[PDB]
């Protein structure tokens, strides 16, 4: 069934599961033509498939070539997403295949279900959470590898860096979703927060800065401040 606030600890139990987010698969810029009509130009995309327990992100880059000569691209995007997820699952050894796949948008349910008919014992589930995974393209190294790709390509990252060495997956997911919520609500400020101090760096093999435990607490407080503000700035309160 649907994933919500009430069955939130299930994400961190020992049954393998993946979140799939398709919000960045089909991406376009909208522009005027010489004749003063409007046209779209697609740019590279990505499927965001994440194991919330391990931090394993399977980032499937969607090259614009996949749209060439195709119609109804927003509908295809959902089916293309489901095709790629199903191919990922089949490529994994049996013992690494997920027992559940949670889609962040309900429109992915039928596409994924049809593509996974061969996997009757994999549950496809929606969620009532408003998860901020669309803001993954605000992570500079993820954005950079998507925009540079010249062909379809799968890139494997740990979205938690080394955090699990010191914190639980529950706490790591909470940190991640706070960082992404912030980046989604006010990218500039969020990015200012994360880098203001030039002495804290991002390891070559990491996505996020190498904060100490105490520095993460300050950071997290600042992200909350940002999120509460923008919410006032938005509704005037």
């Amino acid at each position: 069934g649907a994933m919500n606030s009430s069955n939130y600890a299930e994400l961190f139990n020992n049954d393998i599961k993946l979140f799939v987010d398709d919000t960045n698969v089909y991406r376009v810029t909208v522009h005027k033509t010489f004749e003063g009509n409007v046209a779209t130009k697609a740019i590279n995309g990505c499927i965001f498939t994440l194991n919330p327990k391990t931090g394993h992100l399977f980032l499937k880059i969607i090259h614009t070539s996949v749209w060439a000569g195709q119609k109804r691209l927003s509908q295809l995007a959902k089916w293309k997403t489901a095709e790629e997820v199903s191919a990922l699952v089949r490529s994994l050894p049996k013992e690494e295949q997920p027992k559940q796949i949670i889609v962040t948008r309900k429109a992915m349910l039928d596409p994924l279900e049809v593509h996974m008919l061969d996997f009757p014992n994999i549950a496809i589930r929606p969620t009532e959470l408003r998860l901020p995974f669309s803001a993954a393209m605000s992570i500079d190294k993820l954005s950079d590898v998507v925009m540079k790709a010249t062909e379809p390509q799968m890139v494997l990252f740990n979205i938690y860096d080394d955090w699990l060495d010191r914190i639980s997956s529950y706490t790591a997911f909470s940190r991640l979703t706070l960082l992404l919520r912030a980046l989604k609500t006010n990218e500039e400020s969020a990015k200012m927060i994360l880098l203001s101090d030039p002495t804290i760096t991002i390891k070559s093999y990491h996505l996020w800065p190498s904060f100490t435990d105490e520095q993460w607490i300050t950071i997290e407080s600042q992200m909350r401040d940002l999120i509460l503000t923008e919410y006032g700035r938005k509704y005037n309160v």
Binding site: D110, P111, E113, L117
Partner: protein, 300 residues
Amino acid sequence: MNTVPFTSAPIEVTIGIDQYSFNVKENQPFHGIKDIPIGHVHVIHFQHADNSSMRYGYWFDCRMGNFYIQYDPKDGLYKMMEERDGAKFENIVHNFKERQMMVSYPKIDEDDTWYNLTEFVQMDKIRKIVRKDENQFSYVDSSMTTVQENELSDPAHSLNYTVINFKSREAIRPGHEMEDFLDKSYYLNTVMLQGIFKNSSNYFGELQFAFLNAMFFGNYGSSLQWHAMIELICSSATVPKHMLDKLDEILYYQIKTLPEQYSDILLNERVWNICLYSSFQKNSLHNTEKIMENKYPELL
């Protein structure tokens, strides 16, 4: 014209014969139905005055035998039976006609309704959906579940309709997932029509039989089957032109005949709005759309 005699009418019951019905009182001198048109299947059905639960009845074809009705006080229902002694049967019927104890199948001459509702329905196919091979006639009631219903519990008392499932391997070709889910033409024409039903007449027969069981017995699994078979056609981009024209006629007479007061339960909003307004065949069902819009505009 043929006859279905009744031994007696010991309990107060509303009796149906095709789309007609009449009330019989406890121990009223009622001895059957005469003048039943040859050439069509028929259904004789019952709702007891005391227990409006369980509508039930019998599909039959008088060309296949001499059939009669006899109340069973142990099982407490009117049972169809076959009489194998033809002389005894002729003799029973003639006496009851002479005493005028029989109602007349009351067909208006202009009226083609029953033909139009049963055009493609054949007893031999009914008997394969309703498996009880020692009888030439078939029992159905409100409660009987379908094979597909059982897969989601007594197999002897099931309606063995053809399983249709849009999210199944039978319906979806490996590597055509999107194509086949959005355009079911493959599943309709190759899987179902060519592979399973063999021709569109057997498809329409099951469709019409499913509708009639839904209407006459409120059989929910049959209503599901009727709507699934409609939706499979309407969600196919490629349907033979002769099939669409006939579908329009079939559905038209089903909608025309449905009791105005049962549309709420017997008609699925989603299927009908999708078929008439969103599907590939949204513009291929002119008669059906016009009656639906003038009779049940609320549903849409």
